[PDB]
């Protein structure tokens with residue numbers, strides 16, 4: 401669990417985050433750094449180069465959707481499992497997405513936050529976000545069967 | 546979480562286990578298959594070969610002790626965290642044992658159970674035990690800090 | 691790296707499998723789908739019920755691939771080249787899953803080879819399956 | 832395997848780190864100890880408080896080892912042979928931990944390289960650290 405001081409740190413930093421932009425950046429980097437994750441987006445078009453992926457309008461659009469749901473979750477840190485129950489079921493039953501992808505995205509997101517915030521993304525702040533991305537990934541994986 | 550039927554399968558199979566033997570065999574195989582785990586037992590003597598390791602009296606004795614605690618924990622599948630809380634703090638503060646080791650032993654134990662029970666260790670029974678060893682490992686790593 | 695001893699150990703243990711290839715491959719897959727449900731995300735097009743035709747057929751393919759690997763244990767990267775291309779460019783199974791199937795393959799062998807599954811052989815087989823997994827994911831990025 | 836582009840990206844990124852390599856090494860270790868407490872089991876003899884002399888000194892050794900690997904990026908198995916022996920035969924850090932330090936090194940670099948930490952460089956650095964980790968655990972068994 402996060403300490404009261406960690407929750408405040410998470411919430412404080414997130415208030416400065418442009419969710420749409422970070423979403424496109426995080427999803428795009430996921431597809432570039434771990435190319436096999438492109439397997440779920442064969443309808444998105446050109447993903448043959450880093451720029452082709454990062455600038456792909458469908459990737460940027462989907463990134464908004466993804467981090468948008470992530471952002472809402474940050475407003476319910478005490479009930480991540482309930483918050484992501486319907487999305488968990490959807491990702492398992494309809495999209496067939498291996499939960500490991502959520503973990504990979506979490507790590508990429510941490511890297512993106514560090515890249516954007518620089519020194520402000522202190523070791524303690526990172527530790528707080530590691531608990532957050534882990535919690536979100538576990539919540540999204542909870543309804544798999 | 547061990548469906549009522551999974552709990553029964555676990556208890557039913559474990560009631561046939563010679564904990565002393567299976568423990569020494571499990572710890573021994575851990576040391577043979579993942580040699581780096583030998584780092585915690587330099588005082589146990591000869592570990593230069595598989596047979597040296599398996600026949601090592603200190604290895605067998607420690608395996609017996611470790612699985613004995615494991616065994617007692619199987620009677621409280623609903624509160625593994627509580628049951629192993631003390632050993633958790635111990636392995637962290639005194640022994641300094643990376644919890645990954647608990648996961649490795651868990652896998653080796655499953656292999657040993659399979660080797661001993663043969664066809665009786667069915668896919669469903671395995672599934673139930675995978676939940677048990679993961680639960681025990683998680684419980685033992687719970688108090689780490 | 692696989693030592694002469696590992697190679698000897700693997701060839702002896704896998705040689706005992708023989709005609710039981712498809713059966714053990716299918717059993718390993720079933721054990722994986724039941725113990726690690728997330729692996730089923732890669733087979734939505736499969737009927738994964740006990741004894742399904744698709745699982746049986748796939749089990750035979752996996753087993754035969756391993757038989758071929760064993761025969762070419764000296765140069766698996768070359769023997770598994772096509773398979774490596776397949777998993778890296780098409781299937782794109784996340785790397786973390788290979789350890790799950792390898793573990794279930796070991797369990798399957800352990801449950802069928804009471805005499806051959808010695809501590810030393812156990813170790814060699816684990817290194818072997820890890821090696822195969824490494825080759826199969828070597829071209830992912 | 833590292834491509835020509837990967838090597839160009841790694842050399843460019845690590846070159847920018849330059850004189851701060853030691854500082855970044857210490858920072859990456861600190862991030863690791865705070866985010867993944869289990870890694871502290873390998874340093875019970877260390878004062879792990881912020882800015883401790885031991886962490887500073889160790890961060891320097893780790894960073895220098897990475898600098899050496901970049902200088903010998905086409906011969907890492909040999910350049911890191913001594914370090915590989917040390918971890919495989921003495922330290923025996925479980926393999927799972929290398930990914931944790933690698934991640935923290937990436938986060939540290941991202942926090943200090945606003946301009947060079949592009950998606951392509953991020954990808955190359957991740958492959959590089961994984962390659963170094965692989966070499967360091969290649970002799971474990």
Ligand code: MH0
Nearest residue numbers: 437440441465466467469470487495497501502505536540
């Ligand atoms: C690399 C795989 C992958 C990762 C990682 C992933 C991570 C996440 N996701 Fe989610 N998601 C993935 C692959 C998809 C697909 C394939 C789709 C459907 C896209 C389409 O329309 O073609 C999807 N996700 C769709 C969604 C949708 C849209 C639901 C709908 O269409 O009804 C949301 C809100 C979403 N996700 C949230 C999230 C969240 C939150 C995370 C984690 C923080």
Ligand code: MH0
Nearest residue numbers: 582585610611612614615632636640642646647650681685
């Ligand atoms: C490879 C490392 C390793 C693994 C795996 C491991 C796994 C486990 N252990 Fe535990 N344990 C390990 C290394 C030790 C050491 C080093 C000692 C001290 C031995 C000695 O002779 O001084 C120890 N464990 C000691 C113990 C003791 C005695 C503690 C005491 O003196 O009060 C118990 C009961 C124990 N463990 C239980 C367990 C259980 C339960 C598991 C998991 C199923």
Ligand code: MH0
Nearest residue numbers: 729732733748751752755756776781783787788791822823
């Ligand atoms: C959890 C996922 C997963 C893991 C791990 C995995 C691990 C392995 N695999 Fe491989 N493999 C996986 C998922 C697949 C799929 C989804 C398919 C395609 C099935 C189908 O028929 O649609 C596949 N693998 C297909 C194959 C095929 C058939 C290719 C063809 O038809 O030409 C073989 C031989 C194969 N693999 C071998 C192996 C081996 C050997 C291992 C490792 C020991």
Ligand code: MH0
Nearest residue numbers: 870873874889892893896897914922924928929932963964
């Ligand atoms: C979580 C554990 C852990 C991980 C991961 C790890 C990952 C790595 N390491 Fe390495 N290393 C770890 C734990 C140690 C210890 C405990 C020591 C001993 C330190 C001391 O002063 O007693 C050590 N590593 C020591 C070293 C030394 C010093 C050896 C000497 O004095 O001659 C170097 C250069 C080193 N490593 C580099 C690296 C590199 C490079 C990586 C990977 C990027």
Ligand SMILES: Cc1cc(C)cc(C(=O)N(C)[C@@H](Cc2ccc(-c3ccccc3)cc2)C(=O)N[C@H](Cc2c[nH]c3ccccc23)C(=O)O)c1
Nearest residue numbers: 401402403481534535538541546626679680683684687690
């Ligand atoms: C049924 C179940 C499974 C597991 C794995 C864990 C728990 C459980 O109740 N936990 C172990 C909680 C506990 C927790 C409590 C306190 C702290 C803490 C830290 C610092 C200061 C103060 C408090 C950290 C974790 C946990 O956070 N996660 C688990 C489940 C889980 C985590 N990783 C997994 C991987 C696979 C399956 C399950 C899990 C959960 O809360 O449910 C319950």
